Design a protein around this ligand. Structure first.
Ligand code: UTP
Lengths: 30, 140, 65, 161, 124, 254, 123
């Protein structure tokens, strides 16, 4: 509670990895 | 070449203790080998043997937590190297204090360090622990 | 008949009946038939040490029923 | 990803007759006698089959009503249209009778009555009787009673003929 | 320090994989332990990942060359060692640059596989 | 010299290995042929078992709908060198991962493979020594252990290998729902015009007592398990020949 | 004659064990027949029973050496060949002298194993 009161390159890799995982999951579905 | 028996539990830790980058002082090496030989590292994971040895040599957990009752036998007293070489570790003069120090160090290490090390899941903390262990491999 | 009241299931009853029937077979043919009733199955779980801890959930032999 | 079902590899399905259909006069019954996923007869045409169920004996002839029978350790007779009788002995199982002219008898163990012997049954019966008195508990008594009943049925089947 | 640690880990993985290859080439992959299979998969991905198309060999490779930065290489190999890329196909690491190229190739392969699966399903 | 003798000894060892593997191939082919007799005597025991349990159903609703334990009983071989059967079974299990999944695998390889991959979804495994013929007692033991693992289980999915031909070993599934769900479906088939193919079967079962119905359920479940293990053994022997042939080719190349 | 027969039997058993080692490496000990498992066990005991601590290598080994009499060796190996010591633990034959030393080492092994079991029992 007190923590709440008080208050990019790596993101691209995470975004690409999430997209790849989503595609690999989608293909398995149908 | 062919069941975690005592020989197999201690052989792996002995092999882990043989990794070095710089020559080791006789007192530190003999004390670490004696500790690993008498089962004081059975509860310590193989990955953490080097960190345990570094804390034993370059730190004193008993003094840090105020539980050290030994009179003379401390790892920071470098002059004990020749006393050990003269009398041996398995002598009444040094054996009692050596066992007391090893027991205290094992207890404090396990409790205050291995519990936290086994509770790390965050990627940042995992990477920090991995770097710490690698540095320990090249520090003692 | 009276085995149901004691909790013995139907499958164990079938196994007992088959074992008795095989025991009643002639000497010559039994060599084949006995191969269809000899228990050779066990339940195991791997422990930390590696030993195969044997389970007692179900009896293996008929005498243990 | 959709795994098959082991029943798709078996093309010898079960023919179930529809409710509102004409009747047919059948002269043969398709028998299917099975032991431990193994058949002795494959849709064999027979005149009749006699099976000893729990309630009592059943004489199945072509056109018998759809029924399920829980068999008991007992003989099983098969009489062909030629006039030949073949006798087995079963230890348990089920018999499914279909109004379309089929009888599937699935038994745990179905062995020829000839393969069985008399003296062996007598000695086993004596041993079971002796062990009954020394039964460890109620469960052992019930098990020994089961075995004794099976042996008595075998002996009766042998002595009948 | 990170460069040294990553390089040492890669060398250890390659050494262990080379040791396992002796057993693999005789009996087979299926005759390994559960964790040995994981080591084999990671080492195969490492071996594929080490390849790179040069800007001078475009004629022979038929692909645009790559120039991988030192930091990018360290980060990509460190990530691969941790196992965060276990889902990525093995061939995604073959003849690419940094990790971003690996992910882009994996995305293209996933799209092609999805198209093939859609074509097969529609055939029903 | 020594290096020449080193290669000579290595070649002699490879020759010994090749001879041993050839003997293994002969032994396996003997049992393949010896237990090839099943093919004539199969595909007729499970006829009303189809009516009891055969149901064309979706692979999602049956999985998501259940909120109780989903028991799985993969069939796996004791000895390795079979081929890709165990790997494919593991892949099928992995595709069906759920919070309700419970594993009671069969065979040493299955135990050793599902214990590490799925520690919290693994209770214990069954092992049979391949000394006697796969009989009803073994199937009853498996079923009893499966019930005791999870008595309030939505279903009991058996995954095994179907030996279509000498070179074709597919993966097949037997689904064994809980007694309550089976009773509900049976009553619906008996009453409603739907499930017209099981109408007579369901009505025949209803007319009888409940103990008989339960015995019928258990008996046919055991038969399905027996069929699964037998087909898995035959596929293992055949599948094993492929692996042994691959090993022989590798040894010859070496 | 006894010495010659015992020596020839030992050599033949060692050769047979060397042959069976390849099968063990490929198949495994579990796959061998009971007739072969007994040979394997006896051959392993023979291999370990051939080792001996020398009185001049005490520094290398850290144990007192043994001087085995000729008759004692023949009797011990003859007994081992025919299975008189099939129940003795395998390690009891490692770095010892005659048969008496084997029995003493087996007794010591049993005592320490019992102590370990007692320690485990208390836990
Ligand atoms: O109180 C009862 C009522 C009925 N039942 C059981 O319900 C079933 C009704 O069965 P049916 O009444 O439909 O057939 P059936 O005359 O041919 O009976 P069986 O000779 O084959 O047994 C029979 O199997 C009967 O034994 C009981 O066991 N107890």
């Amino acid at each position: 509670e007190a923590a709440e009161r008080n208050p990019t390159g790596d993101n691209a890799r995470d975004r690409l990895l999430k997209e790849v995982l989503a595609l690999q999951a989608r293909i398995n579905q149908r | 070449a062919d069941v975690q028996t005592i020989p197999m539990i201690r052989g792996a830790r002995f092999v882990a203790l043989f990794n070095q980058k710089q020559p080791s002082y006789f007192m530190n090496a003999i004390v670490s080998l004696y500790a690993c030989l008498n089962g004081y590292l059975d509860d310590v994971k193989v990955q953490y043997v080097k960190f345990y040895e570094y804390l034993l040599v370059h730190r004193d957990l008993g003094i840090m937590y105020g539980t050290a009752k030994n009179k003379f036998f401390y790892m920071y007293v470098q002059e004990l190297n020749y006393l050990i070489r003269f009398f041996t570790l398995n002598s009444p003069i040094l054996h009692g204090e050596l066992e007391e120090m090893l027991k205290q160090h094992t207890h404090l290490f396990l409790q205050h360090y291995q519990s936290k090390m086994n509770a790390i899941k965050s990627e940042k903390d995992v990477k920090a622990l991995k770097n710490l262990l690698y540095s320990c491999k090249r520090a003692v | 008949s009276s085995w149901r009241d004691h909790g013995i299931s139907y499958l164990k009853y079938l196994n007992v009946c088959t074992e008795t029937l095989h025991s009643t077979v002639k000497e010559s043919r039994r060599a084949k038939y006995e191969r269809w009733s000899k228990p050779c199955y066990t339940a195991q779980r791997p422990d930390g040490a590696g030993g195969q801890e044997t389970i007692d959930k179900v009896p293996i032999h008929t005498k243990d029923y | 990803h959709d795994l098959p079902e082991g029943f798709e590899f078996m093309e010898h399905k079960v023919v179930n007759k529809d409710i509102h259909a004409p009747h047919e006069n059948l002269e043969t019954l398709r028998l299917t006698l099975t032991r431990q996923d193994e058949f002795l007869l494959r849709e064999e045409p027979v005149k009749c089959v006699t099976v000893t169920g729990t309630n009592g004996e059943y004489g199945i002839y072509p056109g018998h009503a759809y029924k399920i029978v829980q068999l008991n350790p007992s003989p099983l007779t098969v009489e062909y249209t030629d006039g030949t009788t073949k006798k087995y002995f079963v230890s348990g199982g089920f018999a499914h009778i279909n109004n379309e002219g089929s009888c599937d008898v699935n038994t745990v163990e179905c062995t020829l009555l000839d393969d069985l012997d008399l003296a062996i049954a007598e000695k086993e019966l004596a041993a079971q009787q002796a062990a009954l008195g020394s039964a460890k508990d109620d469960k052992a008594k019930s098990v020994v009673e089961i075995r004794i009943s099976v042996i008595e049925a075998v002996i009766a089947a042998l002595k009948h003929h | 320090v990170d460069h040294y640690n990553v390089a040492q880990d890669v060398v250890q993985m390659l050494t262990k994989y080379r040791e396992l290859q002796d057993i693999i080439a005789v009996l087979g992959i299926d005759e390994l332990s559960e964790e040995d299979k994981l080591i084999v998969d990671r080492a195969r991905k490492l071996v594929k990942f080490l390849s790179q198309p040069f800007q001078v060999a475009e004629v022979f490779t038929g692909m645009t060359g790559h120039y991988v930065q030192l930091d990018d290489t360290i980060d990509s190999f460190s990530g691969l060692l941790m196992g965060t890329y276990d889902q990525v196909p093995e061939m995604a690491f073959y003849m690419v640059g940094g990790i971003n190229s690996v992910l882009e190739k994996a995305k293209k392969m996933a799209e092609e596989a999805a198209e093939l699966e859609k074509m097969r399903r529609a055939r029903v | 010299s020594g290096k020449l003798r080193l290669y000579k000894e290595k070649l002699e060892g490879y020759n010994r290995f090749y001879s041993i593997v050839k003997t293994i191939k002969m032994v396996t082919l003997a049992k393949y042929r010896a237990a090839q007799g099943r093919i004539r005597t199969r595909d007729f025991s499970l006829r009303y078992t189809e009516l009891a349990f055969s149901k064309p159903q979706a692979s999602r609703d049956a999985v998501v709908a259940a909120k109780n334990a989903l028991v799985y009983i993969p069939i796996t071989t004791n000895r390795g060198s079979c081929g890709a059967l165990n790997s494919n079974i593991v892949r099928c299990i992995d595709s069906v991962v759920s919070s309700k999944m419970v594993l009671m695998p069969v065979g040493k390889r299955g135990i050793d493979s599902f214990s590490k991959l799925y520690p919290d979804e693994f209770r214990y495994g069954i092992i049979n020594d391949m000394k006697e013929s796969m009989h009803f007692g073994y199937a009853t033991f498996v079923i009893e252990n499966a019930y005791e693992v999870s008595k309030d289980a939505d279903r009991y999915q058996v995954i095994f290998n179907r030996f279509v031909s000498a070179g074709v070993q597919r993966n097949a599934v037997y689904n064994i729902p809980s007694y309550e769900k089976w009773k509900e479906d049976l009553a619906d088939a008996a009453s409603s015009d739907n499930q017209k193919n099981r109408y007579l079967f369901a009505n025949a079962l209803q007319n009888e007592e409940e103990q008989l119905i339960r015995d019928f359920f258990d008996f046919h479940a055991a038969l399905a398990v027996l069929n699964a293990v037998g087909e898995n053994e035959l596929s293992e022997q055949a599948a094993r020949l492929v692996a042994v042939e691959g090993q022989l080719t590798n040894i010859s190349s070496l």
